[PDB]
CSV table of C-alpha atoms and ligand atoms in Angstrom, one decimal:
chain,number,residue,atom,x,y,z
H,1,UNK,CA,39.9,9.1,27.0
H,2,UNK,CA,36.5,9.1,28.6
H,3,UNK,CA,38.3,6.9,31.1
H,4,UNK,CA,41.0,9.6,31.4
H,5,UNK,CA,38.4,12.4,31.7
H,6,UNK,CA,36.7,10.5,34.6
H,7,UNK,CA,40.0,10.1,36.5
H,8,UNK,CA,39.3,13.0,38.8
H,9,UNK,CA,36.4,11.0,40.1
H,10,UNK,CA,38.8,8.1,40.8
H,11,UNK,CA,39.3,4.6,39.3
H,12,UNK,CA,36.3,2.5,38.2
H,13,UNK,CA,35.7,0.8,41.5
H,14,UNK,CA,36.1,4.1,43.4
H,15,UNK,CA,33.7,5.8,41.0
H,16,UNK,CA,31.0,3.2,42.0
H,17,UNK,CA,31.8,3.3,45.7
H,18,UNK,CA,31.4,7.1,45.8
H,19,UNK,CA,28.2,6.9,43.8
H,20,UNK,CA,26.8,4.3,46.3
H,21,UNK,CA,27.7,6.5,49.3
H,22,UNK,CA,26.2,9.6,47.7
H,23,UNK,CA,23.0,7.7,47.2
H,24,UNK,CA,23.1,6.5,50.8
H,25,UNK,CA,23.5,10.1,51.8
H,26,UNK,CA,20.4,11.2,49.8
H,27,UNK,CA,22.4,12.9,47.1
H,28,UNK,CA,22.2,12.3,43.4
H,29,UNK,CA,24.7,10.9,40.9
H,30,UNK,CA,25.4,11.1,37.2
H,31,UNK,CA,25.5,7.9,35.3
H,32,UNK,CA,26.9,7.6,31.7
H,33,UNK,CA,26.1,4.6,29.4
H,34,UNK,CA,28.4,3.2,26.8
H,35,UNK,CA,29.9,5.7,24.3
H,36,UNK,CA,28.7,3.7,21.4
H,37,UNK,CA,25.2,3.2,23.0
H,38,UNK,CA,23.2,6.4,24.0
H,39,UNK,CA,26.4,8.2,25.2
H,40,UNK,CA,24.1,10.2,27.5
H,41,UNK,CA,24.5,11.1,31.2
H,42,UNK,CA,21.5,10.9,33.4
H,43,UNK,CA,20.9,12.4,36.8
H,44,UNK,CA,19.9,9.6,39.2
H,45,UNK,CA,18.2,9.9,42.6
H,46,UNK,CA,17.0,7.4,45.1
H,47,UNK,CA,13.2,7.5,45.5
H,48,UNK,CA,13.4,7.1,49.3
H,49,UNK,CA,15.2,10.4,49.8
H,50,UNK,CA,13.7,12.2,46.8
H,51,UNK,CA,12.7,15.8,47.4
H,52,UNK,CA,10.9,18.5,45.5
H,53,UNK,CA,14.1,20.4,45.1
H,54,UNK,CA,15.8,17.4,43.5
H,55,UNK,CA,12.9,16.9,41.1
H,56,UNK,CA,12.9,20.6,40.3
H,57,UNK,CA,16.6,20.3,39.3
H,58,UNK,CA,15.9,17.4,37.0
H,59,UNK,CA,13.1,19.3,35.3
H,60,UNK,CA,15.2,22.5,34.9
H,61,UNK,CA,18.5,20.8,33.8
H,62,UNK,CA,17.3,17.6,32.0
H,63,UNK,CA,14.9,16.5,29.3
H,64,UNK,CA,12.0,16.8,31.7
H,65,UNK,CA,10.8,13.3,30.8
H,66,UNK,CA,11.6,12.0,34.3
H,67,UNK,CA,11.4,8.3,34.6
H,68,UNK,CA,10.8,5.9,37.5
H,69,UNK,CA,13.0,2.8,37.2
H,70,UNK,CA,11.2,-0.1,39.0
H,71,UNK,CA,11.8,-3.8,39.3
H,72,UNK,CA,9.6,-6.1,37.3
H,73,UNK,CA,8.0,-7.2,40.7
H,74,UNK,CA,7.0,-3.7,41.6
H,75,UNK,CA,5.8,-2.8,38.1
H,76,UNK,CA,3.7,-6.1,38.2
H,77,UNK,CA,2.4,-5.2,41.6
H,78,UNK,CA,1.2,-1.9,40.1
H,79,UNK,CA,-0.4,-3.6,37.1
H,80,UNK,CA,1.7,-1.5,34.8
H,81,UNK,CA,1.8,-3.2,31.4
H,82,UNK,CA,4.2,-1.9,28.7
H,83,UNK,CA,3.0,1.2,26.9
H,84,UNK,CA,3.2,-0.7,23.6
H,85,UNK,CA,2.7,-4.4,22.7
H,86,UNK,CA,13.3,0.6,26.7
H,87,UNK,CA,10.5,-0.9,28.8
H,88,UNK,CA,8.2,2.1,29.1
H,89,UNK,CA,5.0,1.3,30.9
H,90,UNK,CA,1.8,3.2,30.5
H,91,UNK,CA,2.3,6.6,32.2
H,92,UNK,CA,1.1,7.3,35.8
H,93,UNK,CA,-0.3,9.9,38.1
H,94,UNK,CA,-1.1,9.9,41.9
H,95,UNK,CA,-4.8,10.0,42.5
H,96,UNK,CA,-4.4,11.8,45.8
H,97,UNK,CA,-2.4,14.8,46.9
H,98,UNK,CA,-1.7,16.3,43.4
H,99,UNK,CA,-3.4,18.7,41.0
H,100,UNK,CA,-2.3,18.5,37.3
H,101,UNK,CA,0.5,16.0,38.1
H,102,UNK,CA,3.3,18.0,36.4
H,103,UNK,CA,4.7,20.2,39.2
H,104,UNK,CA,7.9,19.0,40.8
H,105,UNK,CA,6.0,18.2,44.0
H,106,UNK,CA,3.2,16.4,42.1
H,107,UNK,CA,5.8,14.2,40.2
H,108,UNK,CA,7.5,13.3,43.5
H,109,UNK,CA,4.1,12.5,45.2
H,110,UNK,CA,3.3,10.2,42.2
H,111,UNK,CA,6.7,8.6,42.4
H,112,UNK,CA,6.6,7.9,46.2
H,113,UNK,CA,3.1,6.5,45.7
H,114,UNK,CA,4.2,4.1,43.0
H,115,UNK,CA,7.5,3.1,44.7
H,116,UNK,CA,5.7,2.1,48.0
H,117,UNK,CA,6.3,-1.6,48.6
H,118,UNK,CA,2.6,-1.8,49.8
H,119,UNK,CA,1.4,0.1,46.7
H,120,UNK,CA,-1.7,-1.0,44.8
H,121,UNK,CA,-2.6,-0.5,41.1
H,122,UNK,CA,-5.5,1.7,42.1
H,123,UNK,CA,-3.2,4.2,43.9
H,124,UNK,CA,-2.3,5.3,40.3
H,125,UNK,CA,-4.3,7.0,37.6
H,126,UNK,CA,-3.2,6.3,34.0
H,127,UNK,CA,-2.0,8.0,31.8
H,128,UNK,CA,0.0,10.7,33.6
H,129,UNK,CA,3.2,12.7,33.9
H,130,UNK,CA,5.6,10.1,35.5
H,131,UNK,CA,7.1,7.5,33.1
H,132,UNK,CA,7.9,4.2,34.7
H,133,UNK,CA,10.5,1.8,33.3
H,134,UNK,CA,10.8,-1.9,34.0
H,135,UNK,CA,14.4,-2.8,34.9
H,136,UNK,CA,15.4,-6.1,33.3
H,137,UNK,CA,16.3,-9.0,35.6
H,138,UNK,CA,20.0,-9.3,36.1
H,139,UNK,CA,20.4,-5.5,35.9
H,140,UNK,CA,23.5,-4.1,34.2
H,141,UNK,CA,25.0,-7.6,33.7
H,142,UNK,CA,22.0,-8.4,31.5
H,143,UNK,CA,21.1,-5.1,29.9
H,144,UNK,CA,23.5,-2.1,29.9
H,145,UNK,CA,20.8,0.6,30.2
H,146,UNK,CA,20.5,3.5,32.6
H,147,UNK,CA,17.3,1.9,33.8
H,148,UNK,CA,19.2,-1.1,35.0
H,149,UNK,CA,22.0,1.0,36.4
H,150,UNK,CA,19.5,2.9,38.4
H,151,UNK,CA,17.9,-0.1,40.1
H,152,UNK,CA,21.3,-1.8,40.7
H,153,UNK,CA,22.8,1.3,42.3
H,154,UNK,CA,19.9,1.4,44.8
H,155,UNK,CA,20.3,-2.4,45.5
H,156,UNK,CA,24.1,-2.2,45.7
H,157,UNK,CA,23.7,0.8,48.1
H,158,UNK,CA,21.3,-1.3,50.3
H,159,UNK,CA,18.4,1.1,49.5
H,160,UNK,CA,14.8,0.7,48.3
H,161,UNK,CA,15.1,-0.6,44.8
H,162,UNK,CA,13.5,2.3,43.0
H,163,UNK,CA,15.2,5.3,41.4
H,164,UNK,CA,14.4,8.2,39.1
H,165,UNK,CA,16.4,9.2,36.0
H,166,UNK,CA,16.5,11.9,33.5
H,167,UNK,CA,19.0,12.8,30.7
H,168,UNK,CA,21.2,15.9,31.2
H,169,UNK,CA,20.5,18.4,28.4
H,170,UNK,CA,22.6,21.5,27.5
H,171,UNK,CA,20.8,24.9,27.3
H,172,UNK,CA,20.7,24.8,23.5
H,173,UNK,CA,18.9,21.4,23.6
H,174,UNK,CA,21.8,19.2,22.6
H,175,UNK,CA,22.5,16.2,24.9
H,176,UNK,CA,25.3,16.7,27.5
H,177,UNK,CA,28.6,15.0,26.8
H,178,UNK,CA,31.3,13.8,29.2
H,179,UNK,CA,33.0,17.2,29.7
H,180,UNK,CA,29.6,19.0,30.5
H,181,UNK,CA,28.6,16.0,32.7
H,182,UNK,CA,31.8,16.3,34.6
H,183,UNK,CA,31.4,20.0,35.1
H,184,UNK,CA,27.8,19.6,36.2
H,185,UNK,CA,28.8,16.9,38.7
H,186,UNK,CA,31.5,19.1,40.3
H,187,UNK,CA,29.1,22.1,40.6
H,188,UNK,CA,26.4,19.9,42.1
H,189,UNK,CA,28.5,17.6,44.3
H,190,UNK,CA,27.3,14.6,42.3
H,191,UNK,CA,29.7,11.7,41.6
H,192,UNK,CA,30.0,10.6,38.0
H,193,UNK,CA,30.3,7.0,36.9
H,194,UNK,CA,29.7,4.7,33.9
H,195,UNK,CA,27.7,1.6,33.3
H,196,UNK,CA,31.0,-0.3,32.5
H,197,UNK,CA,32.3,0.8,36.0
H,198,UNK,CA,29.2,-0.9,37.4
H,199,UNK,CA,29.6,-4.0,35.4
H,200,UNK,CA,33.2,-4.4,36.6
H,201,UNK,CA,32.4,-3.7,40.2
H,202,UNK,CA,29.5,-6.2,40.4
H,203,UNK,CA,31.8,-9.0,39.1
H,204,UNK,CA,34.9,-7.8,41.1
H,205,UNK,CA,32.9,-8.1,44.3
H,206,UNK,CA,30.8,-11.1,43.4
H,207,UNK,CA,27.7,-9.0,43.5
H,208,UNK,CA,24.7,-11.1,42.7
H,209,UNK,CA,22.0,-8.9,44.1
K,1,UNK,CA,-7.6,39.3,38.8
K,2,UNK,CA,-6.8,37.7,35.4
K,3,UNK,CA,-8.8,40.1,33.3
K,4,UNK,CA,-7.0,43.2,34.5
K,5,UNK,CA,-3.6,41.6,34.4
K,6,UNK,CA,-4.2,40.5,30.8
K,7,UNK,CA,-5.6,43.9,29.7
K,8,UNK,CA,-2.1,45.2,28.8
K,9,UNK,CA,-2.0,42.5,26.0
K,10,UNK,CA,-5.2,44.2,24.8
K,11,UNK,CA,-8.9,43.3,24.8
K,12,UNK,CA,-9.9,39.6,24.2
K,13,UNK,CA,-10.3,40.0,20.4
K,14,UNK,CA,-6.9,41.8,20.1
K,15,UNK,CA,-5.3,39.1,22.3
K,16,UNK,CA,-6.4,36.4,19.8
K,17,UNK,CA,-5.4,38.5,16.7
K,18,UNK,CA,-1.9,39.1,18.1
K,19,UNK,CA,-1.5,35.4,18.8
K,20,UNK,CA,-2.7,34.4,15.4
K,21,UNK,CA,-0.3,36.9,13.8
K,22,UNK,CA,2.6,35.6,16.0
K,23,UNK,CA,2.0,32.1,14.7
K,24,UNK,CA,1.7,33.2,11.1
K,25,UNK,CA,5.2,34.8,11.6
K,26,UNK,CA,6.7,31.5,13.0
K,27,UNK,CA,6.8,32.7,16.6
K,28,UNK,CA,5.4,31.2,19.8
K,29,UNK,CA,2.4,32.2,22.0
K,30,UNK,CA,1.4,31.5,25.6
K,31,UNK,CA,-2.1,30.0,26.1
K,32,UNK,CA,-3.9,29.9,29.5
K,33,UNK,CA,-6.8,27.6,30.3
K,34,UNK,CA,-9.5,28.4,32.8
K,35,UNK,CA,-8.5,29.4,36.3
K,36,UNK,CA,-10.8,26.7,37.8
K,37,UNK,CA,-9.4,24.1,35.4
K,38,UNK,CA,-5.6,23.5,35.2
K,39,UNK,CA,-4.9,27.2,35.6
K,40,UNK,CA,-1.6,26.7,33.6
K,41,UNK,CA,0.0,28.6,30.7
K,42,UNK,CA,1.5,26.6,27.8
K,43,UNK,CA,4.0,27.7,25.3
K,44,UNK,CA,2.5,27.0,21.9
K,45,UNK,CA,4.3,26.7,18.5
K,46,UNK,CA,3.2,25.9,15.0
K,47,UNK,CA,4.8,22.7,13.8
K,48,UNK,CA,5.3,24.0,10.3
K,49,UNK,CA,7.8,26.7,11.4
K,50,UNK,CA,9.2,24.8,14.5
K,51,UNK,CA,12.9,25.2,15.1
K,52,UNK,CA,15.5,23.5,17.3
K,53,UNK,CA,15.9,26.7,19.3
K,54,UNK,CA,12.1,26.9,20.0
K,55,UNK,CA,12.1,23.3,21.2
K,56,UNK,CA,15.2,24.0,23.3
K,57,UNK,CA,13.4,26.9,25.0
K,58,UNK,CA,10.5,24.6,25.9
K,59,UNK,CA,12.9,22.1,27.3
K,60,UNK,CA,14.6,24.7,29.5
K,61,UNK,CA,11.6,26.6,30.7
K,62,UNK,CA,8.7,24.2,30.6
K,63,UNK,CA,7.9,20.7,32.0
K,64,UNK,CA,9.9,19.0,29.3
K,65,UNK,CA,6.9,16.8,28.4
K,66,UNK,CA,6.5,18.4,25.0
K,67,UNK,CA,3.2,17.3,23.4
K,68,UNK,CA,2.2,17.2,19.8
K,69,UNK,CA,-1.4,18.3,19.2
K,70,UNK,CA,-3.0,16.5,16.2
K,71,UNK,CA,-6.4,16.2,14.6
K,72,UNK,CA,-8.1,12.8,15.1
K,73,UNK,CA,-7.7,12.2,11.4
K,74,UNK,CA,-3.9,12.8,11.6
K,75,UNK,CA,-3.6,10.6,14.7
K,76,UNK,CA,-5.5,7.8,12.9
K,77,UNK,CA,-3.4,7.9,9.8
K,78,UNK,CA,-0.3,7.4,12.1
K,79,UNK,CA,-2.0,4.5,13.9
K,80,UNK,CA,-2.0,6.4,17.2
K,81,UNK,CA,-5.1,5.5,19.2
K,82,UNK,CA,-5.5,6.7,22.9
K,83,UNK,CA,-2.6,5.4,25.1
K,84,UNK,CA,-5.2,4.2,27.6
K,85,UNK,CA,-8.7,2.8,26.8
K,86,UNK,CA,-10.2,3.7,30.2
K,87,UNK,CA,-8.6,7.2,30.7
K,88,UNK,CA,-8.7,8.2,34.4
K,89,UNK,CA,-9.3,16.4,32.5
K,90,UNK,CA,-9.4,13.3,30.1
K,91,UNK,CA,-6.2,14.4,28.3
K,92,UNK,CA,-6.1,12.4,25.0
K,93,UNK,CA,-2.5,10.9,25.1
K,94,UNK,CA,-1.6,8.4,22.4
K,95,UNK,CA,1.3,6.1,22.8
K,96,UNK,CA,4.6,8.1,22.7
K,97,UNK,CA,6.5,8.3,19.5
K,98,UNK,CA,10.0,8.7,17.9
K,99,UNK,CA,11.0,9.2,14.3
K,100,UNK,CA,12.0,5.8,12.8
K,101,UNK,CA,14.8,7.5,10.9
K,102,UNK,CA,16.9,10.7,11.3
K,103,UNK,CA,17.3,10.7,15.1
K,104,UNK,CA,19.5,9.0,17.6
K,105,UNK,CA,18.2,8.8,21.2
K,106,UNK,CA,15.1,11.0,20.4
K,107,UNK,CA,15.4,13.3,23.3
K,108,UNK,CA,17.6,16.2,22.0
K,109,UNK,CA,15.8,19.3,20.8
K,110,UNK,CA,16.7,18.5,17.2
K,111,UNK,CA,15.5,14.9,17.4
K,112,UNK,CA,12.1,16.0,19.0
K,113,UNK,CA,11.6,18.5,16.1
K,114,UNK,CA,12.5,15.7,13.6
K,115,UNK,CA,9.9,13.3,15.2
K,116,UNK,CA,7.3,16.1,15.3
K,117,UNK,CA,7.6,17.1,11.7
K,118,UNK,CA,7.7,13.4,10.7
K,119,UNK,CA,4.4,12.9,12.7
K,120,UNK,CA,2.6,16.0,11.5
K,121,UNK,CA,3.2,15.4,7.9
K,122,UNK,CA,-0.2,14.9,6.3
K,123,UNK,CA,1.3,12.2,4.0
K,124,UNK,CA,2.8,10.4,7.0
K,125,UNK,CA,2.5,6.6,7.2
K,126,UNK,CA,2.5,4.7,10.5
K,127,UNK,CA,5.9,3.1,9.8
K,128,UNK,CA,7.5,6.6,9.8
K,129,UNK,CA,7.3,6.4,13.6
K,130,UNK,CA,8.7,4.1,16.2
K,131,UNK,CA,6.7,3.6,19.5
K,132,UNK,CA,7.2,4.3,22.4
K,133,UNK,CA,9.4,7.5,22.3
K,134,UNK,CA,10.0,11.0,23.7
K,135,UNK,CA,7.3,13.0,21.9
K,136,UNK,CA,3.7,12.8,23.3
K,137,UNK,CA,0.9,13.1,20.8
K,138,UNK,CA,-2.5,14.4,21.9
K,139,UNK,CA,-5.8,13.9,20.0
K,140,UNK,CA,-7.7,17.2,19.7
K,141,UNK,CA,-11.5,16.8,20.0
K,142,UNK,CA,-13.5,17.5,16.9
K,143,UNK,CA,-15.1,21.0,17.3
K,144,UNK,CA,-12.0,22.3,19.1
K,145,UNK,CA,-12.4,24.7,22.0
K,146,UNK,CA,-16.2,24.7,21.5
K,147,UNK,CA,-16.1,20.9,22.2
K,148,UNK,CA,-13.4,20.9,25.0
K,149,UNK,CA,-11.8,23.9,26.7
K,150,UNK,CA,-8.3,22.4,26.7
K,151,UNK,CA,-4.9,23.6,25.6
K,152,UNK,CA,-5.0,20.6,23.2
K,153,UNK,CA,-7.9,22.0,21.2
K,154,UNK,CA,-6.7,25.6,21.7
K,155,UNK,CA,-3.5,24.6,19.9
K,156,UNK,CA,-5.2,23.0,16.9
K,157,UNK,CA,-7.8,25.8,16.7
K,158,UNK,CA,-5.1,28.5,16.7
K,159,UNK,CA,-3.3,26.8,13.8
K,160,UNK,CA,-6.6,26.5,11.8
K,161,UNK,CA,-7.5,30.1,12.6
K,162,UNK,CA,-4.1,31.4,11.5
K,163,UNK,CA,-4.4,29.4,8.2
K,164,UNK,CA,-1.6,26.9,9.0
K,165,UNK,CA,-1.1,23.1,9.2
K,166,UNK,CA,-3.5,22.0,12.0
K,167,UNK,CA,-0.6,20.7,14.2
K,168,UNK,CA,1.1,22.4,17.1
K,169,UNK,CA,3.2,21.7,20.1
K,170,UNK,CA,2.6,22.7,23.7
K,171,UNK,CA,4.4,22.5,27.0
K,172,UNK,CA,3.5,23.9,30.4
K,173,UNK,CA,5.6,26.8,31.6
K,174,UNK,CA,7.4,25.9,34.8
K,175,UNK,CA,9.0,28.2,37.5
K,176,UNK,CA,12.6,27.7,38.4
K,177,UNK,CA,11.5,26.1,41.7
K,178,UNK,CA,9.5,23.3,39.9
K,179,UNK,CA,6.1,24.8,40.6
K,180,UNK,CA,3.9,25.7,37.6
K,181,UNK,CA,3.7,29.2,36.3
K,182,UNK,CA,0.6,31.3,37.0
K,183,UNK,CA,-0.7,34.4,35.2
K,184,UNK,CA,1.8,36.9,36.6
K,185,UNK,CA,4.8,34.7,35.7
K,186,UNK,CA,3.3,33.8,32.3
K,187,UNK,CA,2.8,37.5,31.6
K,188,UNK,CA,6.5,38.3,32.6
K,189,UNK,CA,7.7,35.4,30.4
K,190,UNK,CA,5.6,36.7,27.5
K,191,UNK,CA,7.1,40.2,27.8
K,192,UNK,CA,10.6,38.8,28.1
K,193,UNK,CA,10.4,36.4,25.1
K,194,UNK,CA,8.0,38.4,22.9
K,195,UNK,CA,5.1,35.9,23.1
K,196,UNK,CA,1.5,37.0,23.1
K,197,UNK,CA,-0.6,35.8,26.0
K,198,UNK,CA,-4.2,34.7,25.5
K,199,UNK,CA,-6.8,32.4,27.2
K,200,UNK,CA,-9.1,29.7,26.1
K,201,UNK,CA,-12.0,32.0,26.9
K,202,UNK,CA,-10.5,34.5,24.4
K,203,UNK,CA,-10.5,31.8,21.8
K,204,UNK,CA,-14.1,30.7,22.5
K,205,UNK,CA,-15.5,34.2,22.3
K,206,UNK,CA,-13.4,35.0,19.2
K,207,UNK,CA,-14.7,31.9,17.5
K,208,UNK,CA,-18.3,32.7,18.4
K,209,UNK,CA,-18.0,36.4,17.4
K,210,UNK,CA,-16.4,35.6,14.0
K,211,UNK,CA,-18.7,32.8,13.1
K,212,UNK,CA,-15.6,30.6,13.0
K,213,UNK,CA,-17.0,27.1,12.6
K,214,UNK,CA,-13.7,25.6,11.3
B,301,5RP,O1,14.9,6.5,26.9
B,301,5RP,C1,15.2,6.9,28.0
B,301,5RP,C2,14.1,7.0,29.1
B,301,5RP,O2,13.2,8.0,28.6
B,301,5RP,C3,16.6,7.4,28.4
B,301,5RP,O3,17.4,7.2,27.2
B,301,5RP,C4,17.1,6.7,29.6
B,301,5RP,O4,18.6,6.8,29.7
B,301,5RP,C5,16.7,5.2,29.8
B,301,5RP,O5,17.2,4.4,28.8
B,301,5RP,P1,18.1,3.1,29.0
B,301,5RP,O6,17.7,2.3,30.2
B,301,5RP,O7,17.9,2.4,27.7
B,301,5RP,O8,19.5,3.6,29.2
B,302,5RP,O1,-1.4,17.1,30.4
B,302,5RP,C1,-0.8,17.9,29.8
B,302,5RP,C2,0.1,17.5,28.7
B,302,5RP,O2,0.9,16.4,29.1
B,302,5RP,C3,-1.0,19.4,30.0
B,302,5RP,O3,-1.7,19.6,31.2
B,302,5RP,C4,-1.7,19.9,28.8
B,302,5RP,O4,-2.0,21.3,28.9
B,302,5RP,C5,-3.0,19.0,28.6
B,302,5RP,O5,-3.8,19.9,27.8
B,302,5RP,P1,-5.4,20.1,28.0
B,302,5RP,O6,-5.5,21.5,28.5
B,302,5RP,O7,-5.8,19.8,26.5
B,302,5RP,O8,-5.8,19.0,28.9
């Protein structure tokens, strides 16, 4: 019946296709994981089109713990080890062009700095107010997380392989469920899709990335 | 200027007394640090009376990076050292945490309250907490706002001065457009949500004036 609720966004393959196009157009999407996993919907944006206004929306509508999903190669490049001996690294801040690091603009500056393919460890102070996540190799076919869905979506869309996520939260602090996620998506012109949709699509189109 | 804007909340001593009373009554307060420092206002709540609705407000109106201010002793008993050994205002983040039990994903208002009360428990054991997580503990410096003029110390000092458990939560008030709230917006927020506004300088002077060594 999640399946049935999502029918106004199309069938599974169409739900992926439209999410890919929204991303290529610099818009965001809403990605749900398995109902028996976190059963949460995250706003997802591409780093390369990311704006202050998009970041502000995440902060105002989501948990506020905005994460940067990176490939393992990029995380390694940044010398970001895991926070602890979900693949949270130590937290990060831009050294240049920010103040406290927490404003929407500051977080976006931090994020663009980290996602740069020419980035260096020393571009980033640690700890900070952006929370990077290492996407596992293989993506959603290997681990069915929002982290992997984020990076696969960018890759599948032909975009810089870095994205930001944050979990949609209702005003009263409870986590948003499918009906709320659907309404939020229609109000914000953001396609909704599931991790399972992405799994099926990758295989259906022989998408090794 | 900031003085004249704050004068409606009363003189510096009164501003502190009203905040201490708010906390004793289970309500929140708004704490500003120095204008030449972060120049930001944090919502502050006592852990011992913390509710889901209070947490929910912080998530709506603040950065969403809700931090738990702990004594160094409490952080040690949880096995929470500094997140980074060579910290690049020297904010004393530990590794992030989650309740081991009694939560699902950790991020809902209710789950963050559960993690926070689990962590702040003075009989807490390290295994009560998973790491990493979605609550951000901060190690307050010994000596409080007379050691470091931060929101972190302000939070723990306010709890001690009010005679509560020395554990509080903070989060930075954010404007609808993503920029951080400044004094005028913090003042309006306080008057809208019935939260006393005070500054770190108020706390410093209060503590000196009232021989409050803590
Ligand atoms: O923990 C989280 C990051 O703060 C969120 O639950 C987010 O959805 C990423 O998790 P995953 O990749 O496991 O789905
Ligand atoms: O970094 C922060 C928490 O994530 C905020 O800026 C917080 O106010 C830090 O407090 P302090 O004033 O103690 O540095």
